[model samples]
Target: SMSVKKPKRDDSKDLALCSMILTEMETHEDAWPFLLPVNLKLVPGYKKVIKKPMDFSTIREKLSSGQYPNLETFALDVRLVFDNCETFNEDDSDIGRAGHNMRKYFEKKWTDTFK
Candidate 1:
């Protein structure tokens, strides 16, 4: 029984970016693999509805199952990912460098194609 508190952090932009990335990953083969690690990290609980082991398949099934799972909790994890991305300093670690490279790769493509 959790109350739907207003999100403390403003992550609408990050969510929008993530949504775009997800859509691209679905439509484009090249974008999909890089997102696999991130998707796997999010999958266990937050994405349980989309995962297997549920007797019911589909969004309509789980919502109608009479058990309201805390979907917002999963959203918090996604926000944390964005927060981590925002705070990431590329000078400090190789992990940050890799992220930077990945981001640049995407940004370059987006600009070249869309602009």
Candidate 2:
């Protein structure tokens, strides 16, 4: 599906940063719930609530395939994953708590590295 035809935009540096951040997120203990897309069948009405379901695995694939144009775009997807969790799960819930931690960690990393 991903064929290299012409010279695409060179955003390798952004891709590399996004890749490392994703790797760190995946390794974090709280990353389980956000690793893969939520199973719609398992969670009824999930599709209706989460317009765009984002996850670490999907982000990793996109990052690996050079689908992301820049770090900001990649960051948006990462934030989407957590924002979706916060919307669907209660703050005190396991997944929700994990999502908060992961989001905070990501923000800190983002600021430290990029800003």
Candidate 3:
């Protein structure tokens, strides 16, 4: 009766990796802007500009709740957070700078952990 496709591989390993990476990013100095969701009231037209809104806390929840089927899916959301950052901020701005730095840190962490 079920139509959903189950994950083929055990997700334990990938899930652990995602947890570790998220922790590292959370503690990084440049993580301030991404720690929580953007304040729609503070930033006018945020929702209109950024179609997909993602944040560290949200990603953490997704990771802990077994929503991510694999590291790839987890990484996609992480990347989305940064991509949204770039879309909403200028390169020289504080949040934009932080976003770039966080993304670099994440990419390196991902490669070392999984690649």
The prediction achieving the highest TM-score against the true structure is: 3
Better candidate number, 2 or 3, judged by lDDT: 3
TM-score of each prediction: 0.30, 0.87, 0.88
Alpha-carbon RMSD to native, per candidate: 12.1, 6.6, 4.0
lDDT of 3 by residue, 34-76 (tens): 9999988889989789988999999999889989877889999
**Whole-model lDDT, model 1:** 0.40
Q: TM-score of the candidate numbered 1? A: 0.30
Give the clashing residue pairs of candidate 1, or none: none
lDDT tens readout by residue for model 2, 1-115: 3785776755547667777888899999999999888998899989898999999999888888878877888899999999999989999899989999999999999998777
Off by over 4 Å in 1: 1-83, 86-90
In candidate 1, position 83 carries an lDDT of 38
Query: Regarding lDDT, does 1 or 3 come out ahead?
Result: 3
Candidate 3, superposed: residue stretches over 4 Å from native: 1-11
Badly placed stretches (over 4 Å) of model 2 are 1-12
